[PDB]
Scaffold this active site. Structure first.
Site, PDB file in Angstrom:
ATOM      1  N   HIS A 186      11.689   0.003  -0.054  1.00  0.00           N
ATOM      2  CA  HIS A 186      13.150  -0.035  -0.283  1.00  0.00           C
ATOM      3  C   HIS A 186      13.811  -1.321   0.216  1.00  0.00           C
ATOM      4  O   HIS A 186      14.951  -1.639  -0.179  1.00  0.00           O
ATOM      5  CB  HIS A 186      13.874   1.212   0.267  1.00  0.00           C
ATOM      6  N   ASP A 198       7.134   5.008  -0.221  1.00  0.00           N
ATOM      7  CA  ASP A 198       7.972   3.944   0.339  1.00  0.00           C
ATOM      8  C   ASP A 198       7.153   3.023   1.217  1.00  0.00           C
ATOM      9  O   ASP A 198       7.275   2.999   2.448  1.00  0.00           O
ATOM     10  CB  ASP A 198       9.201   4.533   1.057  1.00  0.00           C
ATOM     11  N   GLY A 214      18.742  -1.302   9.713  1.00  0.00           N
ATOM     12  CA  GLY A 214      18.056  -2.520  10.132  1.00  0.00           C
ATOM     13  C   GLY A 214      16.678  -2.269  10.701  1.00  0.00           C
ATOM     14  O   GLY A 214      15.904  -3.214  10.912  1.00  0.00           O
ATOM     15  N   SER A 233      14.448  -0.055   9.259  1.00  0.00           N
ATOM     16  CA  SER A 233      13.561   0.313   8.152  1.00  0.00           C
ATOM     17  C   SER A 233      12.458  -0.698   7.917  1.00  0.00           C
ATOM     18  O   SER A 233      12.666  -1.907   8.109  1.00  0.00           O
ATOM     19  CB  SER A 233      14.345   0.608   6.884  1.00  0.00           C
ATOM     20  N   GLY A 234      11.272  -0.182   7.596  1.00  0.00           N
ATOM     21  CA  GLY A 234      10.106  -1.024   7.353  1.00  0.00           C
ATOM     22  C   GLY A 234       9.274  -1.226   8.592  1.00  0.00           C
ATOM     23  O   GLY A 234       8.090  -1.561   8.518  1.00  0.00           O
TER      24      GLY A 234
END
Ligand SMILES: O=C(N[C@@H](Cc1ccccc1)C(=O)NCCc1cc(Cl)ccc1-n1cnnn1)c1ccc2[nH]c(=O)cc(O)c2c1
Length: 238
Positions: free
Chosen positions: A44, A93, A186, A188-189
């Site tokens: 995403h 994801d 911020g 995410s990932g």
């Protein structure tokens, strides 16, 4: 990270900050070093990212203030997004960034081990979510990398908390029943790192949730163990 504390330099050496130069230079997402030219992150993160040319990967960063125009980074050669990915809420994801140059391993930057497929039957009791994201829903990107210890939640329990969604076994949730500690904007990932037998494993990738650290709303992560074959397919291609 909501309800977290400042990390110490070298604490999460697999943690990276993925920046974008379009339209302006800013932190985009977190990520994890998994190989000498490979970053594992969320799909995403690349919504509207048209080229890998606008991306910069910074490893061995504690503070965002360490990043200036003269700061060394890794260019991204290729963005590999799982081809079944539609949206975070539906799963798949996950993405890989192939770096243009190899990461030199050291005390500030090294890879985190992927979960062993044989260890899908292990209970992780020491899990931490890290990132430079917001401390509350209406906040800002943090200068210092934050950390929070979060308990893993069963698929059954997480499904009870997300009525109207489909929590698949390719997802893994974490959070306190009363909330208070979670990932936020911020983060995410980034990784959800769990220590088992004195070894840290990349158990999850920060993906989605209803708000940040709300009571009875665990954070939803990509369940990395379910993607080991896909990661090997992409990183070990002949
Ligand atoms: O919204 C952001 N990130 C999203 C995802 C995304 C990525 C790229 C572009 C747009 C959106 C995120 O982290 N989302 C985190 C998702 C999340 C995960 C878990 Cl496990 C639990 C709760 C949540 N949250 C629910 N609501 N907020 N957080 C994001 C990313 C980089 C940023 N850089 C800046 O300089 C200023 C920003 O405001 C900023 C915000």
């Amino acid at each position: 990270i909501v309800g977290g504390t400042a990390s110490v330099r070298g604490e999460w050496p697999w943690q990276v900050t993925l920046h974008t130069t379009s339209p302006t230079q800013r932190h985009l997402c977190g990520g994890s070093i998994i190989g000498n030219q490979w970053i594992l992150t969320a799909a995403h993160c690349f919504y509207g990212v048209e080229s890998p040319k606008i991306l910069r990967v910074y490893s061995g960063i504690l503070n965002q203030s360490e990043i200036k125009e003269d700061t060394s980074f890794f260019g991204v050669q290729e963005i590999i997004i799982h081809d079944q990915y539609k949206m975070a809420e539906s799963g798949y994801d996950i993405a890989l960034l192939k770096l243009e140059t190899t990461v030199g391993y050291g005390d500030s930057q090294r890879p985190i081990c992927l979960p062993s497929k044989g260890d899908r039957n292990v209970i992780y009791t020491d899990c931490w979510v890290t990132g430079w994201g917001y401390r509350k829903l209406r906040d800002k990107i943090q200068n210092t990398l934050q950390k929070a210890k979060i308990p893993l939640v069963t698929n059954e329990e997480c499904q009870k908390r997300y009525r109207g969604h489909k929590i698949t076994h390719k997802m893994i949730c974490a959070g306190y029943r009363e909330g208070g500690k979670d990932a936020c904007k911020g983060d995410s990932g980034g990784p959800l790192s769990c220590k088992h037998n004195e070894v840290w494993h990349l158990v999850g990738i920060t993906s989605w949730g209803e708000g940040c650290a709300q009571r009875e709303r665990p954070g939803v992560y990509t369940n990395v163990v379910e993607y080991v074959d896909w990661i090997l397919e992409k990183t070990q291609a002949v």
